[PDB]
Amino acid sequence: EDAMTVLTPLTEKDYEGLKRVLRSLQAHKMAWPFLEPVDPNDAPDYYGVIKEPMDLATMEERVQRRYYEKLTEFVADMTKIFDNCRYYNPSDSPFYQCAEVLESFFVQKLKGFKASR
Ligand SMILES: Nc1ccc2c(c1)N(C(=O)C1CC1)CCC2
Numbered sequence: 673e674d675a676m677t678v679l680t681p682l683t684e685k686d687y688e689g690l691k692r693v694l695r696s697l698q699a700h701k702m703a704w705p706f707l708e709p710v711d712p713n714d715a716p717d718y719y720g721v722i723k724e725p726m727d728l729a730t731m732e733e734r735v736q737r738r739y740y741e742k743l744t745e746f747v748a749d750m751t752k753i754f755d756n757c758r759y760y761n762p763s764d765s766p767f768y769q770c771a772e773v774l775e776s777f778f779v780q781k782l783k784g785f786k787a788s789r
């Protein structure tokens with residue numbers, strides 16, 4: 673990650689861009705598994721396997737609260753979503769497929785955000 677991403681504090685303008693990125697992910701057709709925390713009814717052992725769960729609604733709350741100080745922190749939460757999914761689910765599962773599509777889309781959007789800063 674470049675120096676700007678690591679430590680240039682997020683400005684209010686940056687935050688408007690982060691909101692747009694997040695909304696783009698939330699609107700993507702393959703984002704359904706990631707919109708809200710994993711339901712333990714859908715995976716009873718999930719919270720014993722995944723020590724730091726993450727989901728787009730938690731990220732939204734954090735964005736609205738101005739939790740993130742640096743772009744790296746936002747990227748780290750987003751990456752947790754995908755890493756948790758690839759670790760918990762087998763590589764042939766629809767969940768894993770959704771993570772590979774959505775992460776690629778996130779990278780496209782993130783590059784656009786970084787260029788716009
Ligand atoms: N939303 C939803 C529904 C069912 C399941 C998940 C999520 N899981 C996931 O790992 C998805 C988030 C990547 C756990 C296994 C089954």
Ligand SMILES: [Cl-]
Nearest residue numbers: 698699700701
């Ligand atoms: Cl939608």
